Symmetry: D3
Subunit: 308 residues, 6 copies
């Protein structure tokens, strides 16, 4: 039937997913040389089977990517009937346009590599730009964390009915307006010009900074100040993907957030030990559910407006 | 080396403008439309071994225009043109560039694929609805900007421009307007139709310039104008790079409060201007001419991105 | 299992087909802008399913083609397991060679577009040139109207046993000789040189002009005269595809045909109201049968010599 | 720039004729045949950065010839030739260009695909069995005509040519013969083997010229000749562009009533002519030379289509 | 379900395989012209079916290859759901590198042709270089004769426990060392410098020359002498593929072999009548078993270390 | 015409050496590494219409190096470089070039595919682990040899070289060492780790030169050296073209009996040499420079294969 494999040493999300599906993760024999040259050997037959490979959260993005590509390749030439890549946080997603530079569109290159490696289907969560689906010719299911975020908001913020959803940048409006309209509240936008400007009403309201991902957190931390200076009562930040590299964890601990909420598309345990503002939404059920439905020719649309 | 430039359809205004600036006559193409509007095209001269540029027409009917373009590209390729560049000022189906939570086609990717399979080696276009659309191709795309021309026109036609506001008609236009606002060094603001219009940012007692990449039926831009007046804007202008202007069309602009409505001639505006005094056109033929010339010669087209 | 969708507002043939299969046409949400820019949204899940899309007979060939391409694309990126295009009258089929001109081979371009859009299989009727199957790399089933034509002939023409099958042009010999041999009668050929020449025996025989398609009908009408001048008793014309654009319907009403017979690969109702010489063979059963057999891994060869 | 011309096999007559007209020596290629007639090829000189033309051999054995051609194209491509054109006077498997109501391969499409994947950038050929075969490629194909040469030979060798008939041996040859007949301004007629031969059109007391694109065993052309005499033709000639001439071969032509049998040297005829006085050859090396020269130089090869 | 067809007139191995599977070989209608131009027509429907085509051992390698390619193509455009090529001896396998020459890599070209013809899976035995799997992007199962060879050795050579496995060339070490280690014996290597040198211990031991294929047998015959001159007690040669072209059969009959063992990947009956040193290992069961397992999504790994 | 040469990473030693020999400065590329070591690259100058050579870095981390290379190739392609050649002295994942009886990836094929899809038009490399790897590409690959340089160094540094033995550390290195041994006109021998080391061929009282294409942890080469001494070799040298030298690394070489250990600078050796007196480097920058120069100019790079 279905076989789930995990990208690498991070079984953490893949193990949660396989559990929810009533499955054990398939056997994979890994060997890493010094140059980090990745070795893989699929430890069981996948001949004739529909395979799902869940990319690791091991950290080193180029290592994780190659490993995934290599396992996809190994499964394909081992006669897997189909191979689906489950990539909760899509690598190089922020590199999806030229922006008036002689820049690679590396998210396209990544889509191309996944295709030539032999992927038949992609399942991801909150593509940084939804245009990235168009970077492929194979089907992509781009799951939303929105239902889970709206639920977390209604359950953890007393004042959600009078709050303002804030975008930390110009290109995040659509996302926050969509959330503001669902909750039926206000929205506001920050724009960095080196000075931030705020448009929209946050005074004496709870402010919720919503974004797809936080990396170094320079931006969100500064946005929280700005929001407080403009009269917000308190500030939350909710990111789908919690990268938190560099001084993020330090920037967060010193920042005036009530809480910083992220999904577990990227593993957060280590990060949480050193940062108590962080709360995690488990998205394994959504991913597990999408895999389940996909395999069964069932509908996945359900998951865009609802949490399993 | 030598190049050849052909025009799609019998919109030859842009095409003929372009060929003039380059010191070329438009190539000979013989065009009959059969029965069901089945498109016939025949290249009236040899293109063997030549670098061909086909400038997409402006015959309004988007599927006719697109098929004629594809058929010309094809006819040239199998006639042993050494290279074929499609020049497409207004990229068809550009608005259809994501699923947006629906079982929708990503038609702009279909179009990129069709141009590619038709044999296009290179694409020149202006103000792609989303920059990620370049990523829909594996061939090089040059995405020209009207921005410099617009900035120039704003400074040379709006006296109170130094304290004006640049306004986006919707949430998704944020990035466009903030880039302009930042360059003029003025304020920006955004409108959102709640799913009544809401305006965030200030416009009271200042000229408001609605800026958008394209306007079709103008229902959105014309509402925004009212709200902008309701909000206390002195005068409201509307600036679109692509003036599709159909249906309720020029009706709405007249019965609307725009001081002026500026567009480029990426789409033919001659007829529309007859029934609309408040419409003005920035000629972009020079930019496209210059992009073609430079492209062919190996010089930096990128400079055009910031200058006129 | 199987899902049938119709290209557009013409459900007329697609509805006949779905009926014969015991099915309702799937839900499709269509929106058309002014520029005729086609919008589609598949109104139900097609995930995991074998989809058949039947191209419209809405008239505007480039509109119908793009619409089809767009629905194919939408179904594919919605994870349809397979998508088959049912294209009773193949667009641009008459543009299938260069013919000593710098001409596109647009039927190849059309095959390429259908392929890149994501079609896995084509089902068509009477390709204008059977070489067009070679324009694809995917499987094509090219159904023949011949069995249905031979049946109509045996049942509507008393004198069929002593009739002559006439080709209106040089490149139609094979088709008519094949029909003449099946019926065991004579065949004859018209060739336009601006004068028509007839070779073959039609004197005191019923003459049946057989062709794949009639468009403006200039040719067939003139052939009927010629046949009568050469002594044919009466003349019928039988075309698989009844385009009948331009002055066809006028040319037919003034022409000396006993009857003009066409299939419903193209809708004929409107055309018949204004032309009483026209009779229609329903080919929905054949198409319905091919779809049924294809889906079931059954044999379709049956249909080439026999009417379901 | 410079080009290099290589010959397939040790048929070097056409190849060497061609290279002469171009002032070139044939490139050095080392060729051993192993065991199972496994083909070995080695390019005896650098082709790096060069425009290569490989002229397909005439070693009779069609699969050996085709593999040798593919292997040469490949060897040149991976040796960094900048461009490779296959010159194939007689396109192999051209008769296998449709299914014709059978579970048959479309082998001419297979061949086009194999040439393409072998790395051919361009094809030059003469009298494709069907013009649609150009459509089997995505690369440019130039399909040269023997027609002008044939027309010239007919006028210069048949005294009663002004009142002669051009006759097709079968139904599918109609278009070929009517094009010739129309240019000579004479009569045409067609033969059909009923599925006994039937002749339509007149030939009594006039010279009849059987014209075909190719003759293999000559069973069809030789029967047609009898019937043509039975019908009262004065003298019968046979004119084929491709003289495959195998098996019953030249036997049949001798014991047949042909005044003459004309062919081109797209296939080597030297040996065949030994055992056949009535055979004559139009040399086509000049046309191919001229097509190559012009191709390389960017001039109009199309003129060759009508002239010699 | 599954359908087996045979490449050509050699049903000999294909018939053995179909028997072992409980199947009759599918019907194929073949016609060969003089030029050996191959004609095929699949004599039954393959629509929706998983097809296996077993390449012939008819002798003429280019004929066999084209025939296979043509049947693959015919099956694909006849809507076979899948087509697997069973190619016991992979053609042009010895042409898999440039080797400091301007040589084709013809095994890659062969892989490319098989791919464009429409093969979804390859099943072969003992690729001359296992890198050849990488020449494809589709799955390849490369079966080993090793288990069958080790079994033949243990059962036919009393002294196998004290024998030496010898490679006839430098590039055969891995193969023989692998066999020597399994049997737990010595290995030795011949290297041609025009003089052969032997490294390794063969004195007073039985010597077993093991290789993937023998063609003209010049090398193996000379190696046997060398081995005897160095003190081997007697010499066997075991090749997976017995080509035995040219003077092989004469070279073998005059050579000092105890026996020459080959599989029936290539038919040996005729060859054996004229050479009594030859013994044949039947590998039909292995191939039959791989087909059986593949179709059933079962594991094939079994067969690499074990004989069915 | 002009070319441009860029370097991967901040290993610029080889790159800068190469550009010197060519009289060029390295192109301007701006490189930041984000968070997860996500690679940012920006071409600091126009490459429009230029022939670009990107020299892969030596930053050790193989997946970082490979992604940076792919991203540069991509950035150049979409910036309208007319041609992009990847220069990759040490081909990553080259050891992963077959399955070897496992459900293993063929990662070197994945890599070839990724380079191809990234847009590489041509590959220049040195000493491919297996020559068949060229077959993994459809684009031209030039595989340079260190052999001439090694042969030169052996003759100029080993006094007793005329009666020395060339030794392979394993069974698969046979062909490499016999080619060298044959050219020096000396003895060869081979080592095999029984699956204890076995040595076949003689080395007693003669200098033994271990030759390999690459050494990683040196466990194999360092054991072989012991056995070589145990066997009675006078002095043992080790010669690898690719000195990866990781982990137990230079430790082992020091505590091993090598007179010297020679490597090329396909990989940076500066740091390694600090902790290893017995290491020496043959500079190969001249070969690569010369291959690039000649490649660009259309001259025979093949001469480099045999000479220095
Ligand atoms: Mg699945
Ligand atoms: Mg150009
Ligand atoms: Mg189906
Ligand atoms: Mg050329
Ligand atoms: Mg199967
Ligand atoms: Mg170059």
């Amino acid at each position: 039937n279905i076989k789930i494999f995990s990208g690498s040493s991070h079984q953490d999300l893949s193990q949660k997913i396989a559990d929810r599906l009533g499955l054990e993760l398939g056997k994979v024999v890994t060997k890493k040389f010094s140059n980090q040259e990745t070795c893989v050997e699929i430890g069981e037959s996948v001949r004739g089977e529909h395979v799902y490979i869940v990319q690791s959260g091991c950290g080193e993005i180029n290592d994780n990517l190659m490993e995934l590509l290599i396992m996809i390749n190994a499964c394909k030439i081992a006669s897997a009937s189909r191979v689906t890549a489950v990539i909760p946080c899509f690598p190089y997603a922020r590199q999806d346009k030229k922006d008036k530079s002689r820049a690679p569109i590396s998210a396209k290159l990544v889509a191309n590599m996944l295709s030539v490696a032999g992927a038949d289907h992609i399942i991801t969560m909150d593509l940084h730009a939804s245009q990235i689906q168009g970077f492929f010719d194979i089907p992509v299911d781009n799951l939303y964390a929105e239902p889970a975020v709206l639920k977390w908001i209604r359950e953890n913020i007393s004042e959600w009915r009078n709050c303002t959803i804030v975008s930390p940048d110009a290109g995040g409006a659509k996302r926050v307006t969509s959330i503001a309209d669902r909750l039926n509240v206000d929205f506001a936008l920050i724009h960095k010009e080196d000075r931030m400007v705020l448009v929209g009403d946050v005074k004496d309201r709870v402010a919720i900074l919503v974004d797809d991902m936080a990396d170094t957190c320079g931006t969100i931390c500064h946005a929280a100040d700005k929001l407080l200076s403009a009269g917000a009562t308190r500030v939350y930040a909710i990111l789908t993907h919690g990268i938190f590299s560099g001084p993020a964890i330090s920037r967060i601990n010193n920042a005036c957030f009530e809480a910083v909420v992220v999904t577990n598309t990227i593993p957060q345990e280590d990060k949480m030990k050193h940062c108590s503002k962080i709360q995690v939404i488990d998205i394994s059920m959504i991913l597990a559910e999408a895999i389940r439905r996909t395999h069964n020719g069932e509908s996945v649309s359900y998951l865009f407006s609802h949490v399993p």
